[PDB]
Design a protein around this nucleic acid. Structure first.
Ligand code: MG
Length: 712
DNA sequence: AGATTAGAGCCGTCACGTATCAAGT
DNA sequence: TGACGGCTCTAATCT
DNA sequence: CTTGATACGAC
């Protein structure tokens, strides 16, 4: 059974050893203005580490670790307290604080020992994470690593920009070239100073996972995290009862459902007219409208589906795609047109769709045509235009037709609740929208306003709000309710879907192992390689050309130079015909990875019984053991296609908790939601994270906001 | 009064191929 | 107003 | 003997 690994950390600190070799102490800046002393005081000190605890009931602010305690002075506005490790519980401290305090001493360099650290946050950076930013203004983006109270390891990106003087008030950070991390600066020191906050229009991003090679892997979030964890394990082995490793977990109700081809939605729009018109006459949308109309005509996909694409002058019945100028707050006339009666309108803007940079007077937009026939109808953007058009038709007609009888009959007995926390109207207020399906698959939208102060009402809309209200940690801000996605109701059974910051983390240990096996340079010796292949020859069994390819590989290394890089051998195999795409090479390729000192290609992309890239694909359900007895259920959404060599983002964990119906809730509804979450018309070419009726609800609420500005 | 968490706003993301099971004269 | 989620931010919050 | 329309793969 597969095993996903979340962010949660599993570890045990060697408590006595931590007490034996270090003397911790806590500092509570009593008065606001006091910080300033604490700083000068901290500058004259040399603590092993510093961390912030932010105890609920005060109980100190900064916990700091030394080897030998300096003579503690007494100053007003703050107070210091030498602590014993058993009182660690007393002051509202938790083992995550000790783990963070120990982690602050590590660095990203391989085989890095412990070092003193005055900065209460691990901020890992590199020389390759720096842009010039026009004229002499340095800028570095770093990966802050922090262990929170829930034992989650949050990784964030923080941008630092150069300043030309030692500035008080705001914190001052300096880059340590050798260690690679950013250190807080307490006194004016030689070097260059940085402050938090980007001052450019380039949002720095770090790829979540890189699989191209080891060098690119170590430049990703997973690579840096794995390096830090390995350094911590090899440096704190005396201080750790159990090594710091990511949580294991089992996966249940896995759904390897295959998304249908995106051209299926094109078939749905069959036999109807699709008008295209522009906002008055701006010479920009007018021209873009003509180009869009002509391309669809020659696509030959609409001709198969008998789609009438007509370039009209103004509003027409049926499907109508229009072109506007994205005026909004541009201090001009807004050409956006509101659909009325049976008209269905989907709007597109020249700036976004045509990538119209302020410049050339003619639109250079061109659909991405590929796959033998160069038909623009396969363009991702144009496909999504039809995808929304079908949804808006369903909303107008009030009938479900997109998901085929099958899925529709599966979603018939379930009802969905969507919560929209109102911005204005002082008193806290959320909009509860309930969607119901008739046996004839007709949409029934109903909403009831509820006040967050008085939930004593017995009506259904109030009761569901009361159930969610207790579940949420701080139901006072927007983001508390924005985290809530929907509430699936099966009559007397309810289930809540909530977002979380917990994410899937692939096995960093295995990724490092295979990538090191496939290191591009990986200097070898001819004798050892020949012997290595020789001993494993009896274990290759035989699959016809499989052994012949293996024997061909053995002969290839025989005639080569005694010391060669792996790239030269890899290049030689390409001439030999052992392309890493045919059945013969792949079996040789996979066999080498399991037991050898080199491999032509890793097995990371390909699926395996126990693949290290687990949880990044398909839909699965897991039961993370958070609190003793209180099992928590989560579901993750990956990607149906094979993952690209580089993965930019990660997979978050949505949370399912039974609002009513004990534990039988999750086992029954999840297979229903599994088929709900396998539709490609919400997220193009990808699994929808939430059930698709949530999409339907969002558009209906958006339509309400158009004529109800007070709800915005 | 610095820490933070909020709350909003943005970049990224959605292809050719060898394998093949059955579509046959 | 391709639009969808992560998530990086900045400002707002709560000190 | 022959090819046509789905899959794990790269990359
Ligand atoms: Mg829209």
């Amino acid at each position: 059974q597969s095993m996903i690994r979340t962010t949660r950390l599993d570890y045990k600190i060697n408590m006595m050893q931590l007490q034996a070799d270090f003397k911790f102490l806590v500092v509570k800046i009593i008065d606001r203005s006091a910080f300033k002393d604490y700083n000068k005081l901290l500058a004259s000190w040399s603590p092993e580490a510093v961390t912030s605890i932010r105890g609920r009931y005060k109980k100190g602010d900064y916990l700091m670790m030394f080897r030998q305690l300096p003579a503690i002075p007494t100053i007003a506005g703050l107070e210091l307290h030498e602590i014993l490790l058993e009182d660690m519980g007393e002051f509202k401290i938790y083992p995550n604080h000790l783990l963070q305090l120990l982690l602050n001493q590590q660095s990203a360099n391989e085989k890095s020992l412990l070092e003193p650290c005055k900065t209460p946050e691990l901020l890992i950076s590199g020389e390759e994470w720096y842009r010039e930013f026009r004229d002499m203004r340095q800028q570095y983006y770093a990966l802050k690593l922090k262990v929170n109270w829930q034992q989650d390891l949050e990784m964030s990106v923080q941008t630092f920009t150069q300043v030309t003087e030692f500035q008080w008030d705001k914190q001052i950070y300096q880059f340590d070239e050798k260690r690679g991390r950013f250190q807080l600066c307490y006194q004016p020191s030689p070097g260059i100073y940085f402050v938090q906050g980007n001052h450019s229009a380039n949002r720095n991003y770090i790829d979540f996972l890189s699989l191209q090679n080891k060098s690119s892997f170590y430049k990703s979030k997973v690579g840096v995290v794995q390096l830090v964890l390995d350094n911590l394990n090899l440096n704190a082995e005396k201080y750790l009862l159990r090594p710091v490793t990511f949580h294991k977990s089992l996966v249940e109700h896995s759904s390897r459902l295959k998304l249908s081809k995106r051209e299926t939605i094109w078939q749905q729009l069959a036999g109807s007219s699709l008008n295209i018109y522009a906002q008055v006459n701006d010479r920009l949308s007018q021209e873009l409208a003509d180009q869009l109309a002509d391309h669809l005509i020659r696509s030959q996909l609409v001709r198969k589906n008998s789609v009438h694409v007509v370039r009209s002058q103004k509003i027409q019945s049926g499907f109508n795609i229009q072109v506007i100028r994205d005026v909004r707050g541009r201090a001009a006339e807004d050409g956006y047109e509101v659909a009325k009666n049976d008209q269905i309108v989907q709007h597109l803007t020249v700036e976004n769709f045509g990538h119209y940079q302020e410049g050339d007077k003619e639109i250079t937009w061109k659909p991405k045509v590929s796959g033998k026939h160069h038909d623009p109808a396969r363009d991702v953007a144009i496909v999504k235009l039809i995808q929304e058009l079908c949804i808006k038709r369903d909303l107008a007609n009030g009938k479900l037709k997109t998901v085929e009888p099958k899925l529709a009959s599966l979603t018939q007995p379930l009802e969905f609740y969507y919560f929209a926390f109102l911005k204005k109207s002082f008193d806290p207020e959320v909009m509860v929208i309930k969607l119901a399906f008739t046996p004839e698959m007709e949409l029934r939208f109903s909403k009831k306003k509820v006040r967050l102060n008085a939930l004593t009402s017995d009506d259904e809309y109030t009761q569901v709000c009361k159930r969610v209200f207790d579940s949420l940690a701080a139901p006072k801000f927007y983001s508390a309710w924005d985290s809530v996605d929907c509430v699936v109701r099966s009559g007397n059974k309810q289930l809540l879907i909530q977002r979380l910051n917990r994410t899937i983390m692939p096995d960093g240990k295995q990724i490092r192992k295979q990538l090191e096996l496939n290191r591009p340079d990986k200097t070898l010796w001819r004798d050892k390689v020949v012997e290595e292949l020789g001993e494993l020859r009896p274990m290759v069994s035989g699959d016809s050309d499989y052994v012949a390819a293996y024997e061909q590989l053995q002969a290839l290394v025989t005639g080569m130079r005694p010391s060669f890089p792996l790239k030269d051998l890899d290049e030689a195999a390409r001439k030999a015909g052992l392309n890493p795409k045919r059945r013969d090479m792949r079996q040789v390729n996979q066999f080498l990875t399991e037991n050898a000192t080199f491999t032509l290609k890793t097995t990371l992309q390909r699926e395996l019984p126990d693949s290290p890239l687990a949880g990044m694909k398909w839909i699965g359900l897991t039961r993370i053991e958070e609190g003793e007895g209180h099992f928590n259920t989560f579901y993750f959404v990956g990607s149906d296609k094979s993952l690209k060599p580089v993965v930019n983002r990660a997979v978050t964990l949505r949370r399912l908790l039974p609002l009513a119906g004990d534990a039988g809730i999750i086992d029954e509804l999840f297979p229903k939601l599994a088929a709900m979450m396998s539709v490609e018309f919400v997220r193009s070419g990808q699994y929808t994270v939430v059930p698709y009726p949530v999409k339907y609800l969002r558009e209906y609420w958006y339509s309400i906001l158009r004529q109800h500005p007070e709800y915005r």
